């Protein structure tokens, strides 16, 4: 999370045409690689996955969901059933399997990697995910998914600015907690024998069992949640060399113009270094460090004027998070503090050994 000034664009609230200092969140989204296409039908039981067509080559990063030991293995998935693109197949293998989605199915969802080795973790093993396509006349959906097999799709085409994203992840684990932490129950007095951070009464005499409405020590942390209606403030695109080195309007804007990058001084603490694209939403998605938050498009309508406006942000605070930021760029310290007894007073040894290197050849 990283703290953004902007100028608010309302009707008659009290922040109209004035500044506010908002809290934003940074999701490093390197581009997904779409790798296969699944159809679903309707039954009187619900939907039902019927066909599954994979692209033939898959990254070794992303054949690693299929193994729990990859160092140890012989790397044999998907070695056999990716030869279906190399046999006859034009009467037999796959064109039938794409015929089936045109006719029987009603919902076509698509399977995608995430290139997680661009994220610089120790993880190296991907995240596979079924994304539903939602463009009409499912004859289109099977040709859209037949185009983008094995080819990347990046977050600028999915979302825009000023949309209302949703966040679906896991929360942060706290552990086996107790009752004044799980449920936020009152504390019993200081004169409570045998335990005060309890619920005192656990039920009536009758119904003479305990119910599932009472507050016990039942988990805190690590629950699945979906959170609705976060608003995307910026979509980064942050990598490299469009003609020369390029990071600018990542954390820059039109009122700052120092170009740096969204990552603060000394990195995001425990979280990363971010180099890749990012979605920057309003305040607080769920989870810890390095979670996989999937972002689905909103299910609902937005007519609230808090939901609808477009705001262009004034300033992106790139000061450190690792104790208390004082400066913004690393050359902003040289505005205040010049020569530390460091490579500012170690250059004066480095200049004369290079002069001794100039005195070496002469």
């Amino acid at each position: 999370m990283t703290h953004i000034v902007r100028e608010a664009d309302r009707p008659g609230s009290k922040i109209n045409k004035k500044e506010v200092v908002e809290a934003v969140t940074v999701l490093e989204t390197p581009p997904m690689i779409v790798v296969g296409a699944v159809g679903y039908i309707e039954t009187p039981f619900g939907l039902r996955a019927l066909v599954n067509v994979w692209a033939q080559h898959l990254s070794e990063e992303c054949r690693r969901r299929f193994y729990k030991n990859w160092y140890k293995s012989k790397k044999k998935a998907f070695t056999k059933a990716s030869k279906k693109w190399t046999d006859d197949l034009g009467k037999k293998s796959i064109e039938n399997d794409f015929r089936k989605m045109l006719r029987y199915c009603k919902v076509i969802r698509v399977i995608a990697h995430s290139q997680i080795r661009l994220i610089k973790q120790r993880q190296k093993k991907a995240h596979v995910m079924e994304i539903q396509l939602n463009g009409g006349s499912i004859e289109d959906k099977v040709k859209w998914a037949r185009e983008h097999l094995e080819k990347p799709i990046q977050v600028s085409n999915v979302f825009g600015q000023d949309e209302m994203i949703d966040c679906v992840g896991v929360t942060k684990g706290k552990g086996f907690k107790g009752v004044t932490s799980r449920w936020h129950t009152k504390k019993l007095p200081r004169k409570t024998h045998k335990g005060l951070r309890k619920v005192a009464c656990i039920g009536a005499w009758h119904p003479s069992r305990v119910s599932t409405t009472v507050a016990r020590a039942g988990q805190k942390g690590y629950h699945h949640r979906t959170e609705i209606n976060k608003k995307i403030y910026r979509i980064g695109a942050g990598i490299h060399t469009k003609d020369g080195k390029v990071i600018k309007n990542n954390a820059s804007t039109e009122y700052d113009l120092t170009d740096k990058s969204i990552t603060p001084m000394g990195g995001f603490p425990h979280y990363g270094e971010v180099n890749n694209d990012f979605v920057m939403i309003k305040g607080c998605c769920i989870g810890s460090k390095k979670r996989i938050i999937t972002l689905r498009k909103s299910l609902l309508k937005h007519t609230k004027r808090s939901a609808l406006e477009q705001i262009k942000l004034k300033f992106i605070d790139t000061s450190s998070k690792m104790g208390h930021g004082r400066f913004q760029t690393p050359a902003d310290k040289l505005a205040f503090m010049g020569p530390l007894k460091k490579d500012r007073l170690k250059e004066e040894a480095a200049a004369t050994t290079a002069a001794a290197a100039a005195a070496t050849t002469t």
């Binding site: 703290h3 000034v5 500044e19 300033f315 605070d317 208390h324 930021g325 004082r326 913004q328 205040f336």
Partner: protein, 58 residues
């Protein structure tokens, strides 16, 4: 927008501080809590050797 720390002499980008109003009427921006606490103990900033005011004592 960018404001000045009253104890030390640093710049305060928006967010980033607490700001004290004495009942003289006067308003004091500090940058850290460390500067804010260290003013209320009346450590004079000419005498603490990491500031700007000590630094303009050269």
């Amino acid at each position: 927008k960018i404001g000045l720390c009253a104890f030390s002499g640093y710049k305060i980008y928006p967010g980033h501080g607490k700001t004290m109003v004495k009942i003289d009427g006067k308003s004091f921006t500090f940058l850290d809590k460390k500067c804010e606490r260290s003013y209320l103990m009346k450590r004079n900033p000419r005498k603490v050797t990491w500031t700007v005011l000590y630094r303009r004592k050269h």
